[PDB]
Every structure is written in structure tokens, then in C-alpha cells.
Amino acid sequence: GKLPPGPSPLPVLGNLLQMDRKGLLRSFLRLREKYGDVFTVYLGSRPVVVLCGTDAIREALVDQAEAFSGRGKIAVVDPIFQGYGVIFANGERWRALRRFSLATMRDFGMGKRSVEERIQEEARCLVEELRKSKGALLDNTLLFHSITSNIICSIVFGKRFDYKDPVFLRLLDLFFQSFSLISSFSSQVFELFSGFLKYFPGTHRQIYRNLQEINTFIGQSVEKHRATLDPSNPRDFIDVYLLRMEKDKSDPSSEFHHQNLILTVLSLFFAGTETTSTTLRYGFLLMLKYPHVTERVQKEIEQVIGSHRPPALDDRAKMPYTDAVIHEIQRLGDLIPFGVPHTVTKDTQFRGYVIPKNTEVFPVLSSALHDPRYFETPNTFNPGHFLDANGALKRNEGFMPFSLGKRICLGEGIARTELFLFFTTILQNFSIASPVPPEDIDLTPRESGVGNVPPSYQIRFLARH
Template sequence: MELSVLLSLVLLTGLLLLLLRAGSKARGHLPPGPRPLPLLGNVLQMDRHGLLKSFLQLRERYGDVFTVYLGSRPVVMLCGTDTIREALVDQAEAFSGRGTVATVEPIFQGYGVVFANGERWKALRRFSLATMRDFGMGKRSVEERIQEEAQCLVEQLRKTNGELVDPTFIFQSITANIICSIVFGERFDYKDRNFLHLLDMFYQSFALISSFYSQVFELFSSVMKHFPGKHREIYKNLQEVKAFIAQRVEWHRATLDPSMPRDFIDTYLLRMDK
């Protein structure tokens, strides 16, 4: 019995030493940061009520560029306007890659402008930018769509009769409506039930994606995905969003006029046919 316990301790000690050694080798090529624990990384050093607060505290100690370990995965943090501009503008090509987000990967599977990566994302980005530039050539321009929404905003504010109001919902709605106008070819009334439900699904999902739970899920998704949790709520919400978009795409496909594309979806369908 004593021999088996001794062997277990030796094996455990050896495993910990290997993990620490591997971690120190990896850190040799990374910016400085707090020392991580094996497997857990720096998770226990993070403030579960606000990761941003933790990162700002680390910035004070290590500077604008530092490394934190989320589990066994190292993440290089960039802080400050100048540092971010240097990375995303001056070295845009080197920093153009995107990592996967475990909570949404089962839904989008690497597709879309937001969640794609590599050559697929570059192709989608080029297509999207070209399409946005072409709006106005026989079609309603982006500027016209924004002007239309601005007029609707003015009318909505007039209805308040000068009373104090929280503008958060209104400004969220006009932003979403401009996107809807470009993508779907139509805007929605601010009280439209489908529009309100779509906004609710988006904001619920992104609030959950930004939560501490989702950060932990990123570390242990291979295990946590088999159990109940907020990741399933995100999946349900975004599936509803996908179903809404799919209905719109099918309607566009059935009413498509190749000589007069109305919006982003029409342009995308024509590009697929080509």
C-alpha cells in the first residue's frame, strides 16, 4: 500500500514538473505576464465579476502588452490606443486572423463575416467591402438608407413631446435597422414584434457570450458541452436568428431579379450563381 502511494506521488510530481517546464518554454517566446498554474492557467487570478478589471490591473504591472493563460491556452493582451493601432493598422495583415469562439462554433461552423477565419474570411471580407462600395449604382446607397433611418429617428423623438427618455433602445434600434436595410432590403418599425424578438435574441446571446461562464467554457468546452449550461441558451437563441435569416434568404431566392439586385442578400445569391 505504501509503495503504491509513493509511486503515485512520484508520477504526480513528475507530471507537474513536465507541465511547468513546458509552460516555461512556451513563455520564452511570449510577452511577460503572471505565472500560470498547470491546466488552470491564470483563471483563479481573474475577477469573475469583471475580467476587464483584472486585465487593467495586469496592465499596470506588465505594460500595454502582456500574456495571460486562460487554462492551458496563452492569450496576448494588447492595451492602449497606440498599441492597438500599431497591431490592427500598421501590421493589419499579421493580425488579421481570428480565433474560434467555442460557444458559437457549433452554430456558425467557421462561416460568416464575423466568425470565419483564414482565406474564407478574407474572401467574404473582400466581397462585403466591394458590395458596400457598389451600393448606389442602380441601387439605394448606404447613405440613403442611413438618411431614411435618421428621419424615422427624428419622428420617434418628436413623439416624446420633449419628455426625458432613455435613448439606449432607440439608438440600438436605428443601428440594427440600418444593418437590416442593407442586408434584407427593408427596415422595421420600432414596435415590430419580429424585429424586437430578433434584437432580444442578439443582445441576450452576446451578453452570455461575454460572461464569465463563457470564458470558462472556452477553456473546458470539450467537457462542458456535454452538460446543461448557458452555452445551450446561446445555441437556442442564435438558432432562432439563423432561422429568421434563412427565411429571408429563401424569399430573396424566389423573387430574385438578376438585373436589379435589391440588397446584400441578392448580391450574394448572384455571386453564388456566378
């Protein structure tokens, strides 16, 4: 019962504790080189198994899906962490989230328009909004944040907001705008001894100002909903949930309920949506750099959709190249380098070694996204990574931006639809330009850490007509 090959732990300080993305990337390439695709690294009295590349990951997530279906444990004591962390600490709860979203999506087509439809509409308002700029230089960051969020809003709150609407413009900041944290060793030391640091450790100071403001909007939205709830005609996710806890009314569990709800929506709302908004953004940075490929995309749109018909989810199958560009964008955007960690639910043999129950495993997705065994030019934008001999779309075995297995992204589908419609629509209507020349656009992600996010950039949308 030996774990896989690995380096030597350093006691309670950290052999490699505190390294930065670049330093670790260097360390990671070495470890993988020293031990292979499956190695063990030791941290704070615990071993985490690291899976590298297409094969190792697939052997784990897919060939032994259940064994690896455990989600990384989260152990801390706080107020905020306790109440919420618990709600989703269990693996069963995660399943419950899926089980509800799929069934609800199936049985309750809520509001005279399907998902693909609400996205075709949002794109339509985007094209309407993009003209209101009249060819100026703006930052897609907020726009792309708006459109992708509106979708989650529609499906959950039963409506979409207008890009200028304050209730929306402000909610967008609550979730997506970054807050700088200012501290100094001096101040930190003072806080620790007399700081009541146990009370506002790290980021709590900031979150609570958003958390309270958010818990408010939801809380009051749930309320406006519950009062107009036609039990024969639900309108959105919230109604369909209200109808469920109408039995549990006359109990104080409602406070527990409402809280259950808030995170689910935020977790659903921000992590998926933010990732999608970033993917789009990154997508257009690429589009600027490689104008050649941007043209083909446009030319193809023209041969299948034309200049007037709004693009639909059915064109994706008749547009192999544009679909290939979107795969590449996801492969290179690579927003989740290490990927959410797993925990193996039982004593699991793996390539001969033995990973004990609850041994946290890291499926490094980036190592697959860039896996040389599966991509001709692993670090170069190349739509050919996904096109067969006859210019048709072949699947690449190493393409897993949404991870794999039982634990795959609950929004993988809804996301890819957003990506294709938003992309083809924008490009069917507008032409893109930037101050920077393509050959000087740097794609290198600003990498504060824990995720790839592209550098800021201006962009110009020109209506072809």
C-alpha cells in the first residue's frame, strides 16, 4: 500500500511553501520529469496526489469516475465558512444541485423561451448596445460580464436587466469587481495581538460589505416572488424552489433555506459566469492577434448564416472551423490551470500505487490542455487541433476545460452555447480593431495566481453594416 513516487516533505514550514506561479511552473515541470505523470507531494502532514497530462487524468476521472468523484474538503472555522461550507461540504449536496437543475430545466420550460432562445435575445441586445458606442474604444470586461450574467438572471430571477440599470450595474460590482486589500507587517502584527484578528481575518473585512448587500437583494427578490407565485405557472428557478419549501413554511428552517439559496446562485452565478466572461474576453484578444483566422470565422458565418439571420445553436454543427476556433480559445484561455481538487472516495489502486480514502488528488487540467501527446503545437493558437483531414470537426482526447467524469462542470453545456452564439453574433455584425498591432499583442496572462486571466485591453467594434 504505497503512494506514488514523490519528493521529501519539510516539517511544518514548507519545503516549497510560498512559491509564485512562475517558480512553481518551473518546479512542476521538474517534479513531473523526476517522478512521472503521477506523483505525490507532501503538505502540512498530508499527501496530495498529482495527476499530469491527458492519460493519467482520464484514467482517474473517467475509468474510475466514482472512486475519484469526491470533491476537495474544506476545513476552517469561521462564521461565514461554517454556515455555508457545511451546506455544500457533503458530496450528496453537490449531486442534488445537478439533479435539480437538469430536472427543472426539463419539466418547467419557464417563460415562453428556451435557453438557446434567451441567449439569442441577449446577443440581440448586445448588438443593439454595441452600436450605441459608435466605434469608440471601450473595455469589453463589463459588457461581457453583463451579457453572461443576464442569462443566469433570466433563468433564476425571471428577468434580464438593462446594461445601464443601476440595480444591475451595482450587482455586477458586488460579484465581479476586485477590491484591493492594504496591510503592513506592522499593522498585521498589531491586529494579531490586539487586532481581534480572529474576528476579521484576511478578506472577511471586505466580503461582509458585499455579502450583506447581496443577501438583501436575493432576500427581497425571493419575497417579491413568493407573493406573486402562481403554483400552476412557475416563471424561473426561484418559483420552482418556493413551491418546494411551501411545505417547510411555518418553520424557522426558512432562514436556513434562504442561505442555502444565496450561495447556490452565487456559486452558480459567479464562478461559472465569470469563467465564461473571461473565456469570451480572452477569445477576442486572440481574435485581435490572429486576424487571418478571424476572417475565416467571418467568411464561414457568411456562408452558413448570412448577414441577417441571427445565429442559432444549430449552425455550430455546420461550422466546423468556427467551432474549432472556440475549442482552441478554451484550450489557450486555460482559466483553470490546476483545476478544482478531488478526493478519492475509497482505497484506490492506480497504476499499481494505492491512494487511500480522502487523499486529495489534483487533476492538473493545464497539463492536458497543453499535452504534447495530443496537440501538434501545444502553445500556439491552431484551429487545426480540432479539424480532421477533410476539414471536419474531430474531437481531441486532451480537450477538458470543464474537467471530466461525474464531477464535470454543471454548466459545461450552457456555457458552450453562450460562447458560440455570443461569438458568431458579434462577429456577424461587427468588425474588431485595436490600437496595438496584432504582432505586438501579448497573450501572456496576468497571473496574480490561482487562475489565468488575460491582460486588460481596449477594443473597437465597427458595424460592417
